[PDB]
Amino acid sequence: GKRVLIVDDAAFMRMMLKDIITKAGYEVAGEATNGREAVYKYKELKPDIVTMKITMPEMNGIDAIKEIMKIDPNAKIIVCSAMGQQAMVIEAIKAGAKDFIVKPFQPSRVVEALNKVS
Amino acid sequence: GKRVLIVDDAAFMRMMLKDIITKAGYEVAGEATNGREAVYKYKELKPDIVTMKITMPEMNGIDAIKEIMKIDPNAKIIVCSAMGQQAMVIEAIKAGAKDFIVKPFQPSRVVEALNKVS
Ligand SMILES: [Cu+2]
Ligand SMILES: [Cu+2]
Ligand SMILES: [Cu+2]
Ligand SMILES: [Cu+2]
């Protein structure tokens, strides 16, 4: 599955992600900026993969992951984290996330996380 | 029409071009970098729109417009020009191009032309 839902607080982080993943042959299905928009674009876009940032306004990433799996037990979520967010990454993996990339990431490091999950 | 074939020599100009047009609700049907790729790819992607740069390594923008016009007489081509390329621009309009953008890009100016060819 080539179609990615990019969910991120920061515009600069959505753009890089758009640019790395579409370079690696993935289709950006769409984007979102908080946890509430994330779950809605997901029902809408039925993406194969989701990249989810933890720290976001209104609804944080782990709450987005939780709702997304109750909605779809088979989602494939990669969490985007900062250094020092290791505990939160764990709660993400606990809540369903299949893997994680960390900011600032190596473009190969983002591509293989994508590849490992499909 | 939402799907644009962006054909430019320089990657900086395409991603930028891709960034603006995808921000305006147009979807990058694809991209190209010389006139020969411009004309295969166009049969292939059947794009509604093409943004074509004039000076290409070895198929220049103008002959791509001519070839593309024999292929599809109702194509909608926007040529990308540098400052001082008014002569080359005219031959494009002369050869079929519907409109033109100029570098350094004005976002409202780029969005305006695209809509005009609707
Ligand atoms: Cu809606
Ligand atoms: Cu909607
Ligand atoms: Cu991020
Ligand atoms: Cu970009």
Per-residue DSSP letters for B59-73?
S-HHHHHHHHHHH-T
How far apart, in whole angstroms, are the C-alpha atoms of residue A46 and residue A37? 14
- CA-nearest of B65, B77, B82, B69 to B114 is B77
Task: Report the 10 Å Cβ neighbour count for B112.
Answer: 12
User: How much distance in Å is there from the Cα of A43 to the middle of ligand 2?
Assistant: 10
Beta strands A77-82; A99-103: pairing state: parallel
CA angle B62, B47, B23 (to 5 degrees): 100
How far apart, in whole angstroms, are the C-alpha atoms of residue A56 and residue A73? 23
Beta strands A77-82; A49-53: pairing state: parallel
Which residue carries 């600032």 as its tokens?
Answer: A104
Beta strands A3-7; A49-53: pairing state: parallel
How far apart, in whole angstroms, are the C-alpha atoms of residue A20 and residue B80? 25
Ligand minimally distant from the alpha carbon of residue B31: 4
User: How much distance in Å is there from the Cα of B10 to the middle of ligand 1?
Assistant: 37
Q: CA separation (Å) from A97 to A104, A113, A115, B22?
A: 19, 12, 15, 29
Q: Is B59 left (phi over 0), alpha (psi -120 to 50) or beta?
A: beta
Q: Quick check: A75 and A69 in contact, CB under 8 A?
A: yes
How far apart, in whole angstroms, are the C-alpha atoms of residue A91 and residue A24? 28
How far apart, in whole angstroms, are the C-alpha atoms of residue A101 and residue A104? 9
Experimental method: X-ray
Ligand minimally distant from the alpha carbon of residue A42: 2
The CATH architecture to which A3-105 belongs is 3-Layer(aba) Sandwich (3.40)
Q: Taking ligand 3, which is a single-atom ion, which protein residues have CB atoms under 5 Å away? A: A 8, 13, 53, 80
Phi, psi of B39 (to 5 degrees): -75, -30
Ligand minimally distant from the alpha carbon of residue A41: 2
User: How much distance in Å is there from the Cα of B23 to the middle of ligand 1?
Assistant: 18
> How large is the C-alpha radius of gyration of chain A?
12
Judged by DSSP in three states, A6 sits in strand
User: How much distance in Å is there from the Cα of B16 to the middle of ligand 4?
Assistant: 6
User: How much distance in Å is there from the Cα of A22 to the middle of ligand 4?
Assistant: 10
Look at the domain B3-111 and name its fold.
Answer: Rossmann fold (3.40.50)
How far apart, in whole angstroms, are the C-alpha atoms of residue A25 and residue A23? 5
Amino acid at residue number A10: A
